[PDB]
RNA sequence: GGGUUCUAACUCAGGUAUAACAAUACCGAGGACAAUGUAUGGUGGGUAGUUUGACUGGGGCGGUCUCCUCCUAAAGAGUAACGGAGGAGUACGAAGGUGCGCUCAGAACGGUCGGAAAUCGUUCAUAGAGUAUAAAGGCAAAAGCGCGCUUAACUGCGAGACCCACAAGUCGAGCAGGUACGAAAGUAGGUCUUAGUGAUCCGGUGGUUCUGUAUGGAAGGGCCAU
RNA sequence: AAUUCCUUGUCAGGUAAGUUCUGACCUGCACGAAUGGCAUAAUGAUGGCAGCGCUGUCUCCAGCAGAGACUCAGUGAAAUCGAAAUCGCAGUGAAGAUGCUGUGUACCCGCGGCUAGACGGAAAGACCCCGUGAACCUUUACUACAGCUUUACAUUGAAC
RNA sequence: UUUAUUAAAAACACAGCACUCUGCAAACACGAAAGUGGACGUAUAGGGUGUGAUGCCUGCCCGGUGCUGGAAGGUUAAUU
RNA sequence: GGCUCAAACUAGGAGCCGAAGCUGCGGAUUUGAAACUUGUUUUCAAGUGGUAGGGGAGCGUUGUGUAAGCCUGUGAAGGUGUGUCGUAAGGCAUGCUGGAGGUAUCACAAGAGCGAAUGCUGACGUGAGUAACGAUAAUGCGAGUGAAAAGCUCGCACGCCGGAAGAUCAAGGGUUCCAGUCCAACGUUAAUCGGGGCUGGGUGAGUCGACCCCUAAGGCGAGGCCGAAAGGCGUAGUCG
RNA sequence: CCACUGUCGUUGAAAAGCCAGGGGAUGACUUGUGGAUAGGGGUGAAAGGCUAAUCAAACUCGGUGACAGCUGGUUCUCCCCGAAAGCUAUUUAGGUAGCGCCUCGGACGAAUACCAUUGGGGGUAGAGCACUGUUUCGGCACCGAUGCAAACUCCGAAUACCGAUGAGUAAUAUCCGGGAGACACACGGCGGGUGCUAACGUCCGUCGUGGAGAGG
RNA sequence: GCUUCGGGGAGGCGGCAAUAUCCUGUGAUCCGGAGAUUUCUGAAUGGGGAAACCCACUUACCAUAAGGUAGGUAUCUUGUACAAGAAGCGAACGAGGGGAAGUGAAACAUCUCAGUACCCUUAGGAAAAGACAUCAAAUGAGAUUCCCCAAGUAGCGGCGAGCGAACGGGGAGAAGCCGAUUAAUGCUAAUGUAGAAGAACAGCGUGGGAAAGCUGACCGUAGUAGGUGAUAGUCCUGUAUUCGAAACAUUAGCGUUAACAUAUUAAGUAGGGCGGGACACGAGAAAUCCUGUCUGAAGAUGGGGGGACCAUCCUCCAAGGCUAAAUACUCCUGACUGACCGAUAGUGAACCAGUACCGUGAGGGAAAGGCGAAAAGAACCCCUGUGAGGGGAGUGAAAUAGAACCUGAAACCGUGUGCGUACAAGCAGUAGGAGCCUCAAUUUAUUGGGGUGACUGCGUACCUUUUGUAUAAUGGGUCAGCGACUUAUAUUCUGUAGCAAGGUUAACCGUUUAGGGGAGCCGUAGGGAAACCGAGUCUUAAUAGGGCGUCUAG
């Protein structure tokens, strides 16, 4: 792996770039379709951990418009996108 | 247990996109006065990894 | 900021006792030296570990190794040889942009020094010149030569193509912004073009809210330029 | 010349005839004075050359003696070996053929000899090249280290 | 004296010669050190190097690299 | 070979021979195509040389389940023949040998297939009944014993060594020493003989040697010195 | 105690000897017994000699199944397809990697191939002297006759290549992915360079065959 | 082999390997517990030494001769010249002191290998560690150890080759103390070290022999055991089940005794300079830990840490000692197991094997199993040398089962029969093909099967390696046996199956392939360096343009 016969290999011809963030490793994205595994109506970080939607070491979660919700939910400590927010409030939920 | 190891220098060069890999371009580190502004413009940013290089990149970075 | 002296540390592979070796005591001689530990500079084939290229009508020796032009190259492209010939590793703030203007080399004739050939006048003269440089291909709307004003040798980019294993390389109308020249339509993202070049890593510098290991900073890192 | 390439240098001697030898010349490719120079009696299973004697070294080999070889009896190896019904020649052909083509020759099988071939046997050529092979040796190759040496601090103090 | 087993020599050694080091806990060598050899020796001795009986002898060069002496200047470590 | 109005050459012409090419006939197989539709059937068309290599479908072997089954002394495995079947790997049946195990089928797992590696181990060939039988000091004959005598014993003669090839030890060996008995193997042949097999026997010390006393080189070394550890050195001594 | 010459022996009587000769033989001699020096170490009157038939670094065991881009070998059967010995890069050149070429699967479906008609650009073969050179003769550098040239061209095909339209035939072309192998090629034609229009020579281009293909 | 205590009940004096003398119901042999004896060497210990030997001194006693019996006499450590210890050996695992190189990096020096091999010291049934001068930064937790994750992530790195966490989550186990020490002694309970009983089948045929066949029974808390003349629940030994201990060991509980220990909050300490080492972390912006050297505090109004550093906040109190479990291992004891081997395998070793043999030595290191059910192992005769070897006889189911003994392959070497072959040139065959020989049918030479193969055509082995090999290129004397793409994990693709926008648990628990365990992983969204946003997002002054995405199955 990574050898081209003595010619300087592709990964060594190209430059390194970027840095790794630690915030990204504790931020988790939650899809509207995974919300059916939640027990209850409140959608918080603790409830997303209980539903096994997110890892227990995640600190915060984002709700994005991927599937669609089926019931009214209450969101406390999660960021919700614009499309996901309008889908939640169209299905009768709320965000706080 | 034993696992495949990532080539860490290749993981520092290649990142996963939806249908392939992205990368920065060469020939921008230094000696840049002599280069035209077109080359300085166009050698900036990301390119895709070429499909002929993609199997090697997958062998080098088997987890990203 | 140095020498001299002293003795008490330390030394004796000195003497006298302790049977002996050693130590101990005393005496004697040295003495803050020497010697040793740590650190540090020099020296060091005494010893170790290694390196010491490839192509090549065998190898060595010699030459060559990247880039550009012509030919080989068989009227698209490409195409080899230690095949035949030459160049490059720069230059230039004008030798760039624009508007305007101009036309060369040679020959003959006349004319002070002044001729084969200086400058002046006349007549022929698609270029027999010039083009920063090698060669080839081009060049009159001159791409050649002058003058005025200038900084487009701009920033963000770029439909689309050439070329190409990749990494690279090349051309590009158009769009936005800010300009330069022009009365304007416009032209300008360097130079007639094709050589004047070197990846990554590492480190430096000018910027930047992106990050910032409890938090606020900072360090360090990232991104843009170099 | 233990040194001279050209070179068998030249001249002299020695032989009938001497690329060697001896003497001399000096044009020393490329001698030379303790990596000693030039000599030197004695010495050397040392090198070169020349003689006497002596000879089977040779012309040119002959005869004889013993030990094998040869035959019989007893005992009983070896390396090698794809398989063999295993001839010549001129061609051909991975380019030097018992084996292929054409042709010639040849009844089957021993024994004593012989070594021209079977690119005969033996040893995965030591020459040569190659391998980002090994070793050991060298040095003003690189990088280190031992050793030696420098200074600072410590052991380590006092007085002028 | 030597290549035990293809080289006995012109090779090595050799008495002799020179240079140089070494004042004694010598220089030098083994060793991690203690302890040893040198040597129960002491510069007419011991070590290293070269040369190699003897006869006649051994010329010039200190630029290079070593070795020895010197320190005016330049550079120069840890340290502070 | 042989060939001359050719069996040469030039120019025509007509026949024929001639390949795994083509056709005929029979069979298998890959792909694609119309259908009772998974090879359920009949065909059709185009294919089917092959190294490196890619793809597909199977055979056999050991073992586990199936299997407390089934087969087997009315003869298992194995060995050796024969017949028979399949494209093949291979299957099946059966004569003989053998004498106690084997394994249908479908799955499952592999120490799963050998001609080569100057492969490894054992066996056995060729060379070949060939070389050789180990100092050229040498043997002849008469008796005896014996299954058998060149070689053993005895005798006569001959030859060899005799600063040894005789004798005494040490070292080293370890019974080889002596007698009786045997001859398979060993002895480079034979052997009745032997340093071979077997069974008995044999080595007697105050004076010879060792031990012992003493020490050399050199070891070890109360304490002692040194050293990460292990250990190294060394005094008195104690060995040698 | 040595080992100078020769013969023999060289599957030896012998993993260094025998025979005939040879050297030293009171010395820097030979030899017995015991002891010491140990591997990057020893010892060496110095040959890299010797250190147990082992020496430019002993032997034994261990690291250890060292590594080996090298050589060898790689074991049952049948069916289908089927290469390459090129380019680029490489401390590369007999290794390897991307691309090309093979296979399998999937997607797509004529976008592919052949031919006819037709739209193009060219600077080759040929030819020629208009330029750059070179050349001979005549008249007088110029005029006229006359040759030649890879790096000369006033010219200039056939083929080839890039497009369009159209029929027929064809187990096409393209893309995504699984698995490769190959990157020593050879000869015969054609066009050349090189060589000597030598080479079963060498280096390219292109076709065929072999490679990997039997049959006549 | 002696004594004794138990067991047991008819044979026995170990094996090759029998014979002899004998022993044994007055209880032997044998098995189990205890005891006695226990030469010499060896830590070897009285001194020495070439191990299995040499030489002593001394106390008491005996003997009267030149000796005997019973002791004592090493060294070092700890206690008062006296008592108690130690020493040496031996599997792996632990802790510690030292510490390579081959190799990889397609060279090589940093780095890797690896803190591995090895050397050395020293324990215990485990060791080590361990109770916060620890993490965390959440709503905080609450020692150590081990396992599954986190994760091949964050990082380290000639940023190469490689190396590689932690936080936190799920589990196993849980414990905290100030002596959680060691060693004896006595009771109590349990276990172990010999043992005991243990059901149920007959007939008939075959056969050498019955356990197999046929018919009919029986036991079963005992039916897939090992044997027995072939295959047995009912023949034996066993198995299910139920049970024994005089003696001694071990384990646990209680009590007593004697040895050691029993801090009282921690200064040459924390920190610092220099040089190194350890931390995933190679000096790096390098925290933290260790220390060779040189220094050097504050001391609860104080100090350590929170990855340069400062402030704030949080947390915790070093410089005293201890502490079970979960974890590591096998020289070994018992039980049980195996899609492990079956004599070239499996240990090197199935057998007189660490032997023979090789080496000075360290060390290296084989080969070698099978008669038969029972030895019934061949009386006797014959040939022969009273030899080997054989033939009869006999035994046996079988003797080409006769001891080199089951089966008995191949190479290799013979004997017999049939055909061919001594005028003919070569990979030895193949396609034809005459003749002869031989079996079977057939009305009788006509076919068919088998052997041979005159003569004719064609035809230069195999492997490997190559552009190309009959090649005079490689390899193979032959046969037989063995001999090379594996295993573990990760990952990707394909097939298949289950579930499906979901799928799936791991370690563990478990009366154990079940069931539980959701930690975690993959998928369901991307863009961007990142913050951040999200069917979008990045770049940009730009809503322009452009990049990467969207426009479903895992």
Give strand letter and number of the nucleotide nearest A7 (CA to C1'): G90
Query: Which nucleotides on chain H have any atom < 7 A from a protein Cβ?
Result: 106, 138-139, 148-157, 159-164, 167-169, 488-492, 501-502, 518-521, 523-536, 547-550, 552
Distance between CA atoms of residues A17 and A41, nearest Å: 43
Distance between CA atoms of residues A69 and A37, nearest Å: 11
Residues of A in contact with B10 (CB under 8 A): 2, 11
Resolution (A): 2.6
CB B12 within 8 A of CB B61: no
List, in order, residues 6 or more apart from A42 with CB less than 8 Å away.
Answer: A73, A74, A76
Distance between CA atoms of residues A22 and B46, nearest Å: 23
| Length of chain B in terms of residues written | 64
Alpha-carbon distance A40 to nearest alpha carbon in chain B (angstroms) = 34
Inter-chain touch B7–A2, beta carbons under 8 Å: yes
Distance between CA atoms of residues A30 and A49, nearest Å: 11
CB A27 within 8 A of CB B41: no
Residues of B in contact with A10 (CB under 8 A): 49, 53, 56-57
Angle at alpha carbon of residue B52, lines to B51 and B54, rounded to 5°? 60
Classify residue A26 as exposed, middle or buried by CB count within 10 Å of its CB (0-12, 13-18, 19+). middle
| Length of chain A in terms of residues written | 96
Does an H or E element contain A42, and which? strand A42-43
CA B1 to chain centre: 30
List, in order, residues 6 or more apart from A85 with CB less than 8 Å away.
Answer: A95
* Sign of the dihedral through C-alpha A49, A53, A58, A62: negative
């Amino acid at each position: 792996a990574g050898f081209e016969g003595g010619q300087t290999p592709l990964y060594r011809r190209l430059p390194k770039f970027g840095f790794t963030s630690k915030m990204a490793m504790t931020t988790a994205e939650v899809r509207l379709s995974e919300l059916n595994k939640v027990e209850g109506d409140v959608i918080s970080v603790a409830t997303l951990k209980t539903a096994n939607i997110i890892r227990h070491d995640m600190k915060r979660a984002r709700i994005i418009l991927s599937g669609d919700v089926t019931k009214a939910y209450t969101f406390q400590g999660v960021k919700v996108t614009k499309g996901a927010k309008q889908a939640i409030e169209a299905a009768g939920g709320s965000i706080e | 247990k034993v696992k495949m190891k990532t080539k860490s220098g290749a993981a520092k060069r290649f990142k996963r996109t939806a249908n392939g890999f992205k990368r920065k371009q060469a020939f921008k580190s230094h000696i840049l006065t002599k280069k035209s502004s077109k080359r300085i413009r166009q050698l900036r940013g990301l390119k895709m990894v070429d499909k002929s290089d993609e199997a090697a990149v997958r062998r080098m970075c088997p987890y990203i």
